[PDB]
């Protein structure tokens, strides 16, 4: 038919993490089609400030990818996640940053 | 630089 491909998500920091050190949190969403999508970076469920978006791209199977990122300062107690809404998902899905 | 010719199907 027409592709309905759901994405796979990785979350990771730019640098090895140190509690109290400025860093950048990354969320890589790949393998979706159609391109309409929603990607949000959450700190304990709250929206994070200064979130930035790379230019979308697609691969050889026509499915799309995006990098979403924001500066952050990780701690022992804070939970950072990536929330993704796409129509090949039955409901939005979360992905956790393991520090 | 992109190609000048248009691709029409």
């Amino acid at each position: 038919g027409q592709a309905k491909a759901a994405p796979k998500v990785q979350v990771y920091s730019r640098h090895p993490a140190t509690a109290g050190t400025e860093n950048i949190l990354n969320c890589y969403v790949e393998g979706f089609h159609p391109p309409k999508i929603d990607i949000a970076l959450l700190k304990n469920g709250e929206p994070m400030k200064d979130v930035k978006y790379n230019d979308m791209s697609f691969g050889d199977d026509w499915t799309f990818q995006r990098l979403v990122y924001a500066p952050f300062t990780p701690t022992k107690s804070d939970v950072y996640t990536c929330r993704v809404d796409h129509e090949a998902f039955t409901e939005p899905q979360s992905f956790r940053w393991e520090p | 630089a992109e190609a000048i010719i248009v691709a029409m199907v």
Partner: protein
């Protein structure tokens, strides 16, 4: 020494936030340098080296070309909606085309088209013919090969004009392409139900090619290794992780091995 220029086009009938009607991104060796969308309606850079292009008309010329693709792609989406007897709604038109310059100085070129995320038509630039996916694709393949001119013209662009520009881009961007950034590596772990999981993570290496794996007394543990795909950072660097499950006792036995053009010899890392 091998290189590529590739343009990624995307046209949708129904925009959504972060998805304009039409987007074109061009990449030099997998890194963005030029951008055009249907909102701003103009060519903008994505890399600083782009300031040396010296064609003067370049930015205005490529804007007009993009504005042409934007008009034509609208029309193609209507061609295909009606050709496939589909109703109006969310439809996707995508195209990728570009040239490579190989290690030996050889050239490749590509021009592949997709509709609804599936292969539609694609140029075989050495036979001057097209590979159609459908009976719908074939209509175009017939129209393109009967007239006999579009295949010739695209092959000329990919093999000459495209490569000619590639060589210039690669020269203008040498300090970016030829740079090297070493991975920041860290091994981490945690005990579950008497099983130690070792995680090795390489941060911010450039360029992209990398090798990562676990060694138990210097012996490669490839079967038990879980290695992720290379993912991008926001600065043009890359990221990768490799994991292995071990027995908590044989813990000193296990080392991570990172090999990368930025490091004169393998880096070796342990928890």
């Amino acid at each position: 020494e091998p290189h590529s220029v590739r343009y990624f086009h995307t046209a949708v009938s129904e925009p959504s936030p972060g998805v304009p009607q039409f987007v074109s991104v061009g990449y030099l060796d997998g890194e963005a340098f030029v951008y055009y969308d249907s909102e701003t309606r103009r060519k903008e850079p994505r890399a600083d080296w782009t300031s040396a292009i010296d064609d003067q008309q370049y930015w205005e010329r490529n804007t007009r070309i993009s504005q042409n693709n934007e008009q034509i792609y609208r029309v193609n989406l209507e061609t295909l909606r009606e050709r496939y007897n589909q109703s109006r709604g969310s439809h996707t038109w995508q195209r990728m085309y570009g040239c490579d310059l190989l290690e030996d100085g050889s050239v490749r070129g590509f021009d592949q088209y997709g509709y609804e995320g599936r292969d539609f038509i694609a140029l075989d630039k050495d036979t001057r013919t097209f590979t159609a996916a459908d009976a719908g694709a074939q209509i175009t393949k017939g129209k393109w090969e009967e007239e006999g001119t579009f295949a010739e013209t695209m092959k000329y662009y990919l093999e000459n004009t495209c490569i000619e520009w590639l060589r210039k881009y690669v020269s203008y961007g040498k300090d970016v392409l030829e740079r090297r950034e070493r991975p920041e590596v860290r091994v981490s772990g945690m005990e579950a139900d008497k099983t130690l999981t070792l995680s090795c993570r390489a941060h911010g290496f450039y360029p992209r090619p990398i090798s990562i794996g676990w060694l138990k007394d210097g012996v490669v543990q490839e079967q038990e290794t879980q290695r992720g795909s290379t993912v991008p950072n926001s600065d043009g660097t890359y990221h990768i992780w490799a994991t292995i499950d071990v027995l908590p006792g044989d813990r000193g036995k296990y080392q991570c091995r990172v090999e990368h053009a930025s490091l004169p010899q393998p880096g070796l890392f342990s928890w």
